[PDB]
Structures are given as structure tokens and as C-alpha cells.
Amino acid sequence: PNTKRDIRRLGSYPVPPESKNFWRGRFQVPGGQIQQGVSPMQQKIFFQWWWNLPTRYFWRFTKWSDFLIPSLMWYTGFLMCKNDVEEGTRSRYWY
Amino acid sequence: IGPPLRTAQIGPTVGGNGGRTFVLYLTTTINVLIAFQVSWACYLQPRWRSFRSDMLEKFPSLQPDMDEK
Amino acid sequence: YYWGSTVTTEMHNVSPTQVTRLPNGMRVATQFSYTDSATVGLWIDAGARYETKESNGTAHFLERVLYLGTKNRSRDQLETEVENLGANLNSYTGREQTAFYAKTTKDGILPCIDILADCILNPKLDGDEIEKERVRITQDLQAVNQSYEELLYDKVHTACYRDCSLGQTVIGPEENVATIKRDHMVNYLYNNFTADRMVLVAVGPVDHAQIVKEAEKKFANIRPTAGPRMLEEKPYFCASELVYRNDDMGPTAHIAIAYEGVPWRSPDYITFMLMNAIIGSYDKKNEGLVPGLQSANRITQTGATRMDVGCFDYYTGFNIAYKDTGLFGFYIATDEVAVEHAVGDLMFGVTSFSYSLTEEEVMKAKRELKTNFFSGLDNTTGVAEDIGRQILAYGRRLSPAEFVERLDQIDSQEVQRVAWNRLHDAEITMTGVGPLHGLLQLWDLRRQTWWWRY
Amino acid sequence: KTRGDPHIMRGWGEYVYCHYEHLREPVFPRKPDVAKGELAAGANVTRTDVWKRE
Amino acid sequence: TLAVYHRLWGMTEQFAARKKWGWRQVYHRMLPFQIALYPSLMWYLFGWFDDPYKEAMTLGIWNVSKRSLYFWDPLRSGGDKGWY
Amino acid sequence: SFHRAFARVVCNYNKSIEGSVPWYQVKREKSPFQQVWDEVFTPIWFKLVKGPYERWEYNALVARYRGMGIMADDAMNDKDMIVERALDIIPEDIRIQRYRRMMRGAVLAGRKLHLPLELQNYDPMVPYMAPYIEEAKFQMQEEQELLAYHPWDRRLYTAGVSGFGETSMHSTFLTM
Amino acid sequence: FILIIKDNIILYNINDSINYLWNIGYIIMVVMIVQVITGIIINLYMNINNGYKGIIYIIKEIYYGYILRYIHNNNSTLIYVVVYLHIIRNLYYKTYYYNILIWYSGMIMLYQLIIIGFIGYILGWGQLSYWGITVIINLISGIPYLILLISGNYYITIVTIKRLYIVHFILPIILIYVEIIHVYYIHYLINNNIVEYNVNNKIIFNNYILVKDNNGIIFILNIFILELNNNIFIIADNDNLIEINILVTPIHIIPEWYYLYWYSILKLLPNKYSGLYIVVNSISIINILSEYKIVISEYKNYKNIIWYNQIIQYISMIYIGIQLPIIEYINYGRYIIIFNILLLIMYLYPKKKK
Amino acid sequence: PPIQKPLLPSGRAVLKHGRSMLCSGNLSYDVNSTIKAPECKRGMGFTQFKRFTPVPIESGVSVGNRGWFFPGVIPYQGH
């Protein structure tokens, strides 16, 4: 569950037995907030995928480029071993 | 009304986590013993035997073959 | 483990208690104090225990009527004389000991000896006084007019000591109270209030020689001795339940659980005093500087956490000693639904003395035991009670230094040895009043005196 | 630019930048230099005399 | 008064040593349980050992002659070579 | 009894190290061997490996925080008890902005978006939680020492709690 | 138990910001059910006296028995792929840092799964099955008379198959029970998020997360059906369709792909016992990765270099297992093992202060 | 030796508000005195069991609240 301060309830109505987990994830919101939304039945349901598509893949690739140098080094190890194996076999067996 | 007043909890707020400490101690001990066994058998043991053979080159400590112990 | 001696130079700086035996056999004990007030009284070895089943209640009746006039004086004259001296005559009667003392100014010490001697030796047990007191005693005898702590204190003795006179109550049964007459009281005075069983205790700006001279003069005609008391076996401790299940007296339940204790003169008595201090006492309405949730007392701390509410509205340990037996246990006043947690926690605490008691808890308890004892000796009446009770119990008064010397030797290991011998896997008695659905059978509670762990 | 020091921690192990740890303090903690701006909170206030003015 | 505070601060300096001692005392109280654990193990593992170790482990009380009249291997009842 | 002898050894040893200065408060001079190692290995290692690697990781972390619009101290998880105890006592104005920053970050991260660059010019490594983390550690150390210096015995599996120390009911599998 | 279902499915709250990597656990639970169901059905027709002839009988004579045979074999491959990906996921986000109880409950299911899968492979009763168990059982030849008690004879026989079959039938049912302890700890100890901190953006599971989880599990099903019916990936070695010959060894003796990592560890280290112990080390050492840390941080969302090297290290070790015991491969494999040890030490060690 | 005081020390002021040593009556027997010797209506001894706190018991009043709950709120399964 969340912190004791967060899950401390203001109301005295008992927690229903089917909502135990729901009220253990309560948060104590400081300063209030305004939440707004619209039913999906009155919205475009696929455009956001297209609108966010290029930025999603740009940030994905720039993060994954951090593994470029490690992967090249492992790949360099993969090549050396493969060709060290071939030379060893030929030297030991081939005439 | 208003935001709730600040108040510190009455501790202690930790404890009762002994089963996790046992798992830590148990796992560290096993892996430490594994380290000694692996290091001894894979590296130190063969080198000791090679050193033993070198001393045998002296031939004054040659092992009897009729000992049939 | 031994951590040193806690005796100090100040403990040795106390006026000595001088005890002398008069020729008739009355002991006279005095301690000088730099006070303007004094306490003089007679602590007599007598009580309900030494009464027979038919006469039980006579001693209490006599105590109430003793100050209601004498042969020489009258109730109005006696009350007037004491008031003119600026003093107040007090008295009490217990199962094994009785006292008749006067709190007075310095000039009234010797006059009060005369009044107390006249009351004890020449009581005018007028029939009218007896009949009026019979009405008062009868009302007192009703259970509705008694507190629940008083009821349980009597019922603990009734349950534990079924075979001997210690089970008798001081007030007595209503059948006896209805029939007591002057002759009963006159016989009790003759048999029990004898010189060999009396101690004259004077504490204040007093001189031992002067008190002795007055005592010999005023108690000259007291009966020197009475026949030796009957020889009896060790009082048998009966492991029993005596529970009054009443669901029409509100939410609070009162429970008392007892173990067999030790006599006054036992070498283990001071250990049982310390164990009583370790159990301690707690009150939700007087928590003190330290809250229950952060208490050093282990019983208190674990109790305060139960169900986020606490399972002890009130509890106290008790250690009751008699000449040849004792009772050691705890008393609880708790919510009905909390009784199983409360008895279980206070029994787990007593069982812990036999297994896992820390040096820290013992050392804290020694200091709070010493604070309680020394603070009780602050006023003259406190000193007088201590002198009189101790001389009756031990034949001598233990000095504060001696008490500390013997307490220094007791440690966690000594508590563990005594508890293992006497309290571990021991028989218990349970007594109760109020809504006690949660209280289990005696055998179930008697299995909590030992642990599967360790 | 940021005020953090990239090399605040040393030795073997996976890199990490953070400001806080769980370790215990000594009963006689180093006296903080509040005159220069150092923070005084916790043991360095209670078990020291930095708070004392003249 | 600072001296008093120094003493009050310092009375818990050795917390780690005191908590170690506490657990060492819990472990001391658990050592007696070995008296039943070890014999129970050897009791369950007795059939695993070889006969000469069975005899030594029991100080010679158990031996081949003590095997049941109807040994679980009937060809070895009365000895490894049978009764006769 | 050997336990009694062991108990005396422990008592005497601990009595002989009371008031000892902690290792960190000693004025320590490096040995003539560690000084040589610091003269040779440390400078080259910093220039070629440690310096560049740690700058690379640090600069990435600052960018990640700036993209979410959060501070470094916002990133602390309240499953850590010191963080939870510190968060109990932070003043309301600090609390309000911390919550708003953390909410914006999660929305941005969940929707795979980044904070506009117009709002990214701030230092994310300002240690605003430091006063309260230090107070919380002090409170917890006092409680550890004065109230938890021994493994206490309690009645087991009673009142919803195992009796092994935890204080919340129904907080383990065996107390369901 | 309709109010327990409602508290853990209908009104169960989860963060909105989780990725599809949080859908892996749901996939494991569903495919696990399928593997148990298809196993029970397969045993209605299977012959334990000759597993070789039972498989042929199911494939040819039973109506749609080929579906049962291939689903059970191929779904076991999917169980290990999804479980290993779940392990990689947990390592990447360091979910073990605070939710260690969840990690412990999971590792138990991992240990059980290893035993379940191996014995099942033996039930095929082919060349690799017979020779694989013969090789592995010899590892415990040090313990006296232990091999005889386990095998029930001096060589592997139908006696061994009968007893291993009971373990294969029952142990998976126990694994399902441990899945309830795993879900209990997940619901009590709230799940981690893609961000380090805890934020107020949770939504109910049934209306949002379950729809997304079904989309993922249907996408994995489109791939599993292609493999199931057309064998686009070779996931079962062909050598297990050869009848057992106890006198002649097969060309190579290797387990399924999902045991290759541990197989190579043994094949690499010279001493047999050392190889077994290093196998023990890898699974146990990852249970205490965060235990020695002292700073207030979960090491989350850095560049995760050590993580990536470790994942590639698993892949390379798996690759070396496939190859013959060439000397050059042995040398490189040993370097990888040493490299893996250093990576783990990086995880464990706490940092000093400059 | 005998113990003459309850195991739980009062910790409160003996004298009542506005009343001094001079005008408090006799603290040994005065009804309003906080240290008056209890009357042995049923005999001496029960003071070892007696609760000396003047406030009446409020059954089930909470003392185990660490700040996790507001007054009047019922914990459900400890949370």
C-alpha cells in the first residue's frame, strides 16, 4: 500500500470488502486538481497513435543508441572467436 | 478543514524483516564457498600438482611403485 | 550479571529504629525524626485468619466499635479529647495483621498513648453502638456496594485457599454479621489482643526511654500471653476458577490471575518484589511521560499495539505475602472483547521471566522499586506502617541499606532461576467479574505458563 | 549548467548519482559551517553548538 | 549541563554491539534443540549407511545378527550368504 | 559454563572501546603506497575511463529529468522508509509543487511525450529534500537505539500481526 | 469468492503509464493453464511403457492428436521464452529493489519450472532423452547410493520413467499454487512503474488493463499459431526421434534450447562439481543484487549498460552451447564466465564517497 | 518490606488548584485530598488491586494510534 499519510481516509464510512485494494492505493492530493475528459464514443480513437508516431520512435532510437558501442564490442568478440575457431580446426586437422 | 497538520509517526517503523536477512546470509555463504571450490579446483589444484611433479624431478622423493598400499 | 553496588552514603544517614521488649512481652519500637508531627500506634498480630468459621467477622466488628466509647470515657468525650489535641485516631484490620494508630502533634504523643491504651484494654462495647454498626456493616457487605477490585481481592483468596482460614473474608459472611454480639467481641479481645502479639510504634520527635516508660505504665494490666497458635500445614494452593459472568454490568471486565507466591521470610521474597515491579502497572487514563507504544515495560508496550487500540485499560501486578504462603499475579480491567489478548499478553510476560528477561528491564525495575519504597517512608505514618508491618513480618526492620544490598545481588539470572523453579509450568487460579465470554478455561490459561520456543 | 558533481561517489560498482544515504551518524558529529551556507539539520544541530549565537 | 548531554548522547554509542549480543542470546537459547535434531536425522538416515558404520554408530548394539527374521532382501536374511 | 566466560569477554572488549573516534573522524594520511597509486593510476583512469563514462551518465540523467520536468529529489520512491518519514514533515508549499511536477512527469512518460524546451532551463539537482531527510534520519536513529536494541519476544500470530516485529495488521502472507 | 475476484480483477488499480512489458506476466498465466490442460488430455492416450510409440500413436491414430502433441511441445518453448523475457524485464527496471518478496516468489516458480521441463523432455523416450538424463544424473554420483535410489535400477529404464512421470504430473499443479502467492504479493506490494516514483494515475484493471493484455496475448497467439502449424523456427532437436540405443551415443547430447545456458556452463568448466556449483551461483546470486546498497536510490533509469552486457552474455553462452566442444570455444566461454562474474560484482558492490 | 504505594506513580500535583497546605484541610482524611488513606470498609488489602486514577475507565479507548488514522475513522484490516 501507499504511505500511511496517503491512505489515511477522511470519511468515516467503512471500506467495502470488495474495495480493499482500491483504497490502499489512495493518495492525499495537495492543492487540488481539475480533471477533464470526454467519452471515447465522441472522440477520434486512432489519431493519437499517428500524431505521436514520429516522436515516439525518435526518442526510442536515441535511447537505444546508448547500446551501440557495447553491442559492437560483443559483435567484434563474436567475429574473432568464429574465425579463431576456423583457424584452429584447420591447423589441427587440415593438411 | 484545510490540509492535514504535519505529525511524525510513532516508531519504530522498521523491523520484522528477518527472513530477508536470513536469505542474504544463506546466499552469501553458499557463493563464498563456491568461490573457494571453483578457484581451488580450476586454478590452484592443477598448478599444485605441476609443482609436485617438479619436485619429483629431484628423484630423491620418488614414490614407491611396490608399496601396494 | 553483577554491575556493582548501588548503596550510597545517604542510605546510612537515617535515625536507628530502637526496639525493646517490655517484661510483659510487648515490643516497643521507635524512630526519631525531625518533624513537628508524630504517629503512635499498636500493630497487633491478629486478623480474620485467626478467627473460626462461625466467628468470622468479629475482628472487623470490634475494630469499628473500639473507638465508640470506653469504660472511662464516652464517644463524645473521646472524640472531643482527640480533637482538642489536634489528632486523629485511625485503625484497620486485615487477614493477618491489625493496627490502631494516632496521627498527632508533638505535644499529643503521650496523651494519645493513654487514649489508645484505654480503647484497646477497656473497650465499652455498648449494645446500641453494636446495633448501629451492624446496619452499616450489613450495607457494606452487599456486593452492589463493593468495588470490583475489592470483590476480586476477596475472591482470589476464596478460590486459592479453600482448605484454610486465609480464604475467609475480613468482613465475614452475612450470617455471622447478623449474630455477632458483645460476648463474641469480648472473647476476641481476650484471646488475640495480648502483649506478646503487640508492637507499640512511635515515629516523630520522640524519645525511646519516655515512650517505653509510658507504655509500661499504660499497658501494665494487658494479658501477658495467650496459648500458642495451633500448628498447621502449609496452606494448600488450589488451582481453581471462580468467575462471575455478568453481562448486565457494562463493558469493562475485571480479571485476576494468581500464582502461588512466597512467605514474608522467604529468601526469594525480594526477588518476587522485583518481579512485581517488572510487571508494573499501566493505565490508559494516566499514561505518564512515556506513552504505552514506546514504553520500556515489555508487557505495556506489546499491549498498546494490539489492534491499534491497546488491550489494557488498566493492569497491575500484585505480590501478597503471609506468614507461610503468598500470592503473586496480576489484575486486569479491560474491554470485554480484549480479555483474551490481555490475559494472554500478561501471561506471556510472566512466562518470559523464565526464558528471556533483559538486564535493562531488571535495572529499570530496581530503580522504580527503590523509588516506590523510599518515597513511602517520607511521612511519619509511612514510617510507622513500615516499622510495625516489618517487625510483625520479620521480627526486625530491614534498613534501606540492607534492602539495597540484597537487591544488588538479584539480577536477571536470579529472577530466571526463581521463576523457573516456582512460576514456570505452575498452577494458576483465575477469578473474574463482568462480561467474560472471552475468558478461556483454566486449563487453557494454565498452558501459557510455558513456551514451545526456547 | 547543473550544480551536481558527476563524480561524487567512487569505487567499484554501478554508477549512481544521489544526495542521500542511510548510514548512522556519530554522537559527536562534525560542526557544520552555517556561516558559509552549509545545512544544519539532524544530529549536527542537536549534538553540536552551531545554533548558539552570542 | 553539556556534560550531562554528552553522557545522554553517548549511552547508545554501542548500539551495534548491543544488538549483536541480543541475537547471540537468542541463538544460545536455541542450541539445546540440537539434542533432538541430530539423533532424529541419524534415525531417518540409518538405512543409508553401510553395515560396519551401522555397528560403530550404535556402539555395536546393532549388527548383522540383529536384522529382522524376514529381511527386506529375503536372500540376505540371516546374513549375506543366507542362513546356511 | 562457557557462555558465562564468553559474556565476560564481550563485556570487557566493548568497555575497552567506549568513546573511540570513528574511522572517518580520524585525520588520516595516505600511506606511501596509496599515494603512488593515486599519482599514476587515478589521473589516467579519470581522463580516459571514469571521467568520460560518468559525465556521459550524469548528462543523460539531467536530460531525463528535464524531459519529465521533475527534480532529482522528486525521483525518490516512498517505499523507502526514510523517504516516507521525511515526506510526513515537508511543508505544504514544497509538497504542492512536488506533487504537480510528479503528476506531469508521469503523464508525459505514459503518453511518450517530453516537456517543451521552453520549460527545461532549470537545475534539476537542487537538494530541496535535504533538511527533511536529515531530520527523518535523526528521528529514526533515536528510535532504533532507545527502542530497538534487542530482539524482543512477543506472542506470535495474534491481533493480525506475526509477532516478529512488523506493526501493520495483515501485512504478510501468513497473516493474510 | 466472488468478492475476492471483484477486489483483485474489477476494482484492482494499476498505473496508466505501464508499457506492454507489463503484459508478460498475464501471458505466462494463460499459457501455463493451456500447458496443464493439454498435458492432462495427452495422458488420456499416452503410453508410459514406451513413450516413443505413444507419441506416434497420438499423432497418427487419435483424431486431432497432432494438435495436442505439438501444442504441448511448442507451448513449453513459449513458456520459457515468456518467463525469461519476464526475468529480463524485472532485471532492467530493477523491480527486485523494493518488491523483493515478489522476486522471491517468482524464483521459486522458476526453480520448479526447470525440473518440470527437464523431466517432461525425458518422457519423450528418444535418444536425446535417454542420454540427457544419463549424463545429468552422473553429476550426483559423488553422493553414495543416491543414483540407484533415484533411477530405481543401475541404468535408466521404464522404472525411472514411471516415477518421473508422477513428478511431472503433480509438480505443475504446485507451481500454480505458488502463482497465487506471487499475485498476492503483487496486489499487496504495489507494482512498479516506468518512472521511479509513485504517482496518482491508477485506473481499474478490467476495463483498461485487461483489454490491453488481451491485445498482447492475441498478438502472441498469431505468432504461436504460425509456429504451431508450420514450424517456422526449429525449437525441437530432431535427434529425439531416433529410437534409444543404450550402447551407441547420438551425434550430440544437448537439451532443449532453454537449457543451453546451463549446459554450456558445465561443458566449459573442467571439474564436474565446479560446473554444477557455477550453475547454482547464477540463479542464486541474482537474488541478492540490491542487498548491499546503502544509498537512497534504486539505480533505475540510468543507461543500464551492465544490464545490456548481461543479457548479451546469456545469448552468447547459449550460442556456445550449440557448438561442438572445440578448444577455442572453451577458452572464449571461460572468458564470458569471468566477465559475467565481474558484472554481478558491479551490481552487488556499494559505492564509497569521494 | 511492604510496598505502600501503587506501582503506577500518579505524577500529578497533590494540592488542588488554588488550595495550599494551609487551607486544604487534613490531607490524610479529607475527601478532596488526593493522598487520603482509603477507608477499609471491607478490610485492609485491596489497595494492591485498586486503580488510583480518578478518571473512570473508557472501554476500548484508543492508545495504539501512531498517527495513521483520524479520530472516528475505522481501520479496515489494519489499513
Ligand SMILES: CCCCCCCCCCCCCCCCCC(=O)OC[C@H](COP(=O)([O-])OCC(O)COP(=O)([O-])OC[C@@H](COC(=O)CCCCCCCCCCCCCCCCC)OC(=O)CCCCCCCCCCCCCCCCC)OC(=O)CCCCCCCCCCCCCCCCC
Ligand atoms: C554449493 C551448494 C549450494 C546448494 C544450494 C541450495 C542451498 C540449500 C537451501 C536452499 C533453500 C533455502 C530456503 C530459505 C528459507 C528462507 C525462509 C524465510 O526466511 O522465509 C521467510 C522470508 C520472508 O522474509 P520476511 O518478510 O523478512 O519475514 C517476515 C514475515 O513474518 C515472513 O512471513 P511472510 O508470510 O511474509 O513470508 C512467508 C513466506 C515463506 O515462504 C517462502 O517464501 C518460501 C520458503 C520455502 C522455499 C521452498 C523450499 C523447497 C525445498 C524443500 C523441498 C525439497 C524436496 C526434495 C525432494 C527430493 C526427492 C528426490 O511465504 C510462505 O510462508 C508461503 C507458504 C505457502 C504454503 C502453501 C502450501 C499449500 C497450501 C496448504 C497445504 C495444502 C492444502 C491442504 C491439503 C489437505 C488435503 C486433505 O522468505 C523470503 O523472503 C525468502 C523466500 C525464498 C527465496 C529464495 C531462496 C534462495 C536460497 C539460496 C540458494 C538457492 C540455490 C539455487 C536453488 C535452485 C533450485 C532448483
Ligand SMILES: CCCCCCCCCCCCCCCCCC(=O)OC[C@H](COP(=O)([O-])OCC(O)COP(=O)([O-])OC[C@@H](COC(=O)CCCCCCCCCCCCCCCCC)OC(=O)CCCCCCCCCCCCCCCCC)OC(=O)CCCCCCCCCCCCCCCCC
Ligand atoms: C584461535 C585462538 C585459540 C583458539 C582456542 C580454542 C579454544 C576452544 C577449544 C577447547 C575446548 C575445551 C572444552 C572443554 C570442555 C569441558 C568438559 C567438561 O568438563 O564438562 C563441563 C561442561 C560444561 O558443564 P557446565 O558448566 O554445567 O555447563 C553446561 C553447558 O554445556 C555449558 O555450555 P554453554 O552453556 O557455554 O553452551 C555451549 C555448549 C554447546 O555448544 C555447542 O554445542 C555449539 C553449537 C553451535 C552450533 C553448531 C552447529 C553444527 C556445526 C557442525 C559443523 C561441522 C563441520 C565439519 C567440517 C568437516 C570438513 C573440514 O558448549 C558445550 O557444551 C561445550 C563443549 C565442550 C566439548 C565437548 C563437545 C565438543 C563437540 C564434540 C563433537 C564431536 C563430533 C564427532 C563427529 C563424529 C563423526 C563420525 O560439560 C558439558 O556440558 C560438555 C559436554 C557438552 C556436550 C557434548 C557432546 C557430548 C556427547 C556425549 C555422548 C554420549 C553417548 C552415550 C551413549 C550411551 C549408549 C548406551
Ligand SMILES: CCCCCCCCCCCCCCCCCC(=O)OC[C@H](COP(=O)([O-])OCC(O)COP(=O)([O-])OC[C@@H](COC(=O)CCCCCCCCCCCCCCCCC)OC(=O)CCCCCCCCCCCCCCCCC)OC(=O)CCCCCCCCCCCCCCCCC
Ligand atoms: C561439513 C558439515 C557442515 C555442517 C554445518 C551445520 C550448520 C548448521 C546451520 C544451522 C542454521 C543456521 C542459520 C543461521 C542464520 C543466521 C542469519 C542471521 O544472521 O540472522 C540475523 C537476523 C537478524 O536480522 P536484523 O536485520 O538484525 O533484524 C531482523 C529484523 O529486521 C528486525 O529484528 P528485531 O530483532 O528488531 O525484530 C524482533 C524479532 C525479529 O524476528 C525475526 O527476525 C524473525 C523473522 C521471520 C521469521 C519467520 C519467517 C517466516 C517463515 C519462513 C519459513 C516458511 C516455511 C516453513 C515450513 C515449511 C514446511 C514444508 O526478533 C524476535 O522475535 C526474537 C526471537 C526470535 C525467535 C522466535 C522463536 C519462535 C519462532 C520460530 C522461528 C524463528 C527461529 C529463529 C530463527 C532461525 C534462523 C534459522 O535474524 C534472522 O535471520 C531471523 C530469522 C529468520 C530466518 C528463519 C529461517 C528458518 C529456517 C528456514 C529453512 C532454512 C533452510 C536453508 C538452510 C538452513 C541451514 C543454514
Ligand SMILES: CCCCCCCCCCCCCCCCCC(=O)OC[C@H](COP(=O)([O-])OCC[N+](C)(C)C)OC(=O)CCCCCCCCCCCCCCCCC
Ligand atoms: C545435516 C543438516 C541438518 C540441518 C537441520 C535443520 C533442521 C530444521 C528443522 C526445522 C523445524 C522447525 C520446527 C518449528 C516448529 C514450529 C515453530 C515454533 O517453534 O513455534 C513457536 C510457537 C510459539 O510458542 P510459544 O513459546 O509462544 O508458546 C506460548 C504458549 N503455548 C505453549 C501454550 C503456545 O509455537 C507455536 O505456537 C506452534 C505450535 C507448536 C509446534 C510444536 C512443534 C511441532 C512439531 C511437528 C511434529 C512432527 C515432527 C516430525 C519430525 C520427524 C524427524 C525428521
Ligand SMILES: CCCCCCCCCCCCCCCCCC(=O)OC[C@H](COP(=O)([O-])OCC[N+](C)(C)C)OC(=O)CCCCCCCCCCCCCCCCC
Ligand atoms: C581420556 C581417557 C578416556 C578413557 C577412560 C577410560 C574408560 C573408557 C575406555 C574404553 C576403552 C575400551 C573400549 C573397548 C571396545 C571394544 C570393542 C570391541 O571389541 O568391539 C567388537 C565388536 C564386534 O566385532 P566383530 O564385528 O568382529 O564381531 C565378531 C562377532 N563374533 C565373535 C560372534 C564372530 O565390534 C564392533 O561392534 C565395532 C564397533 C565398536 C564399538 C564402538 C567403539 C567402542 C565403544 C566402547 C564403549 C565402552 C563403554 C562400555 C561398553 C558399552 C556397551 C555395553
Ligand SMILES: COC1=C(OC)C(=O)C(C/C=C(\C)CC/C=C(\C)CC/C=C(\C)CC/C=C(\C)CC/C=C(\C)CC/C=C(\C)CC/C=C(\C)CCC=C(C)C)=C(C)C1=O
Ligand atoms: C547433460 O546435458 C545437460 C542437460 O540436458 C540433458 C540439461 O538439461 C542441463 C540443465 C538442466 C537443469 C538445470 C534441470 C535438470 C532437472 C532435473 C535433473 C530434474 C530431476 C527431477 C527432479 C528434481 C524431481 C524431484 C522433484 C522435486 C524435488 C520437487 C521440485 C520442486 C521443489 C523442490 C520446489 C518446492 C517443493 C515442492 C514443490 C515439493 C512439494 C512437496 C509436497 C507437496 C509433499 C507433500 C507431502 C506430504 C506428506 C504432505 C545441464 C546443465 C546439462 O548439462
Ligand SMILES: CCCCCCCC/C=C/CCCCCCCC(=O)OC[C@H](COP(=O)(O)OCCN)OC(=O)CCCCCCC/C=C/CCCCCCCC
Ligand atoms: C521442513 C521440510 C522438511 C522436508 C523433509 C522431507 C522428507 C525427508 C525424508 C527423510 C528420508 C530419510 C532417508 C531414508 C532412507 C532409507 C534408507 C533405506 O531404507 O535404505 C534403502 C536401501 C538400503 O540398501 P542396502 O543394500 O542396505 O545398501 C544401501 C547402502 N548401505 O538403499 C539405501 O539405503 C539408499 C539410501 C539413499 C539415501 C540418500 C540420502 C541423501 C540424499 C540427499 C538429500 C538432500 C536434500 C536437500 C534438500 C534441499 C532443499 C532446499
Ligand code: HEM
Ligand atoms: C509448465 C508445465 C509443463 C511443461 C513445461 C511441460 C513440458 C513437457 C515437455 C517438454 C514434454 C516433451 C515434449 C516432447 O515430447 O518432445 C512433455 C511431455 C509430456 N507432458 Fe508435460 N509439461 C508440463 C505440464 C504437464 C502436465 C500438467 C501434464 C499432465 C497432467 C503433462 C503431461 C505430459 C505427458 C503425458 C507428456 C508425454 C507426451 C510427450 O511425449 O510429449 N505435462 N511435457
Ligand code: HEM
Ligand atoms: C510461473 C512464472 C511466473 C508468472 C506466472 C508470473 C506472473 C507475474 C505477473 C502476472 C505479474 C504482475 C504483472 C506484471 O508485472 O507483468 C508479475 C510481476 C512480477 N514478477 Fe512474475 N511471474 C512469474 C515468474 C517470475 C520470476 C521467475 C520472477 C523473478 C526472477 C518474477 C518476478 C516478478 C517481479 C519482480 C514482478 C513485479 C513486477 C513489477 O513490479 O512491475 N516473476 N509476475
